[PDB]
C-alpha cells in the first residue's frame, strides 16, 4: 500500500565522480497499477492533448475537476504515460481527492507499472523539486 | 536475500526475468536503470547518473584488475551506478568478499548472479545495449 519515494539530486565532477543528495517522501500505491518498485528520471507532465526516452517517472499535479478542462481523467493520464514509456507515474491529488477513489477502483485491466499518489506535505515537497529544476531521479520503493 | 532481476529489452517492449542474491556489500533494496557493461579490467568513460553495472569476474589468479570486487562496486557507485550486478560463476571467493561482515555497506544494492541465471544476463550484455534492469526484493 505505502510507497516510499526517494528523490535524488546528483552532481558530477568533470572527472566523472557523482555526489548524490536524497530527500524522502511518502505516498500510496493505487489499484490502477501494480505494487512494485520503480526508478527513473522525473518528468513533469503537462495536460494538453514519445517526448522522452523509455524509463521516466511522470509527475502530474491535478486540478479541481469542476474547473478542470482536461480531456483525460486521472486514469487516462496514467495509461497514456505508461503507453509513452513511463516506468511509473506519481499524481498529486490535493485538488482532486475523489481521484484516489478513481485510482483505487476495481480495475478492468491494471497497468504493469506503479501508479502512486501523494498529497499534503509530501506533494508540496515533490512539486518544489519538480519545479525548482529538472534532472532529479525518483526511487519508488515498496516495503 | 534473493534478488529478482527483470530485464526490459527493446526493438516494441518485452520482458524476461532471472534471479540472484543481495550481498551485504550493499543494501537490500530495489533499483532500476539502463544496463552498462563494465570492463572486466578498468583503468589499471562517463555515463548518466542511474545505470546498473554488470560484469563477469575472471578467475582471480588470471584477473589483471587494479580493483577488488568491492573496489569495483564502490567505484561503480561513485561513477553514478544505481546498482551493481556481478556474474561470479568463475570466482566463488568473490561471494565471501562481498559478504564480509562490513561496517561500510553501500546504500545501493550489490547483487551477484551465477549458473544459468548469469549466462542469461551476460548474453544480453555481450550482444548489444538498449537494455534496462529492474532489481526487486519480493
Author numbering:
A (entry chain A): 31 to 79, 88 to 181
B (entry chain B): 31 to 41, 49 to 81, 88 to 181
Text of the article:
Rspo (R-spondin, also roof plate-specific spondin) proteins are evolutionarily conserved from fish to humans and have well-documented roles in a broad range of developmental and physiological processes resulting from enhancement of canonical and non-canonical Wnt signalling. ZNRF3/RNF43 specifically targets these Wnt receptors for ubiquitination and turnover, hence reducing Wnt signalling responses. Direct extracellular interaction with Rspo proteins inhibits ZNRF3/RNF43 activity. Here we report a molecular level analysis of the ZNRF3/RNF43 ectodomain structure and its interactions with Rspo proteins.
The ZNRF3ecto crystal structures revealed a distinctive variant of the protease-associated domain topology. Two β-sheets (comprising β2, β1, β7, β3 and β4, β5, β6 strands, respectively) splay apart, accommodating an α-helix (αC) at the open edge; two additional α-helices (αA and αB) pack against the β4, β5 and β6 face of this distorted β-sandwich. A disulphide bridge, conserved across species, links two structurally elaborate loops, β3–β4 and β4–αA. The crystal structures for apo xZNRF3ecto, zZNRF3ecto and mZNRF3ecto showed no major differences in the main chain conformation. Comparisons of ZNRF3ecto structures for proteins crystallized in several different crystal lattices, or for crystals containing multiple copies in the asymmetric unit, consistently highlighted an acidic region (N105-E114; residue numbering is for mouse sequences unless otherwise stated) within the β3–β4 loop, the short αC–β7 loop and the extended β1–β2 hairpin as flexible elements of the fold. Our crystallographic data provided independent structures for multiple copies of the ZNRF3 ectodomain in eight different crystal forms. All but two of these crystal structures reveal an extensive interface (average interface area 992±109 Å2) formed between two ZNRF3ecto polypeptide chains. This dimer is conserved, and pairwise structural superpositions yielded r.m.s.d. values of <1.3 Å (for 275 equivalent Cα pairs). The interaction is twofold symmetric; strands β3 and β7 of the ‘subunits’ abut face-to-face at the core of the dimer. The β1–β2 hairpin forms a second interface by reaching out to embrace helix αA and the β3–β4 loop in the opposing subunit.
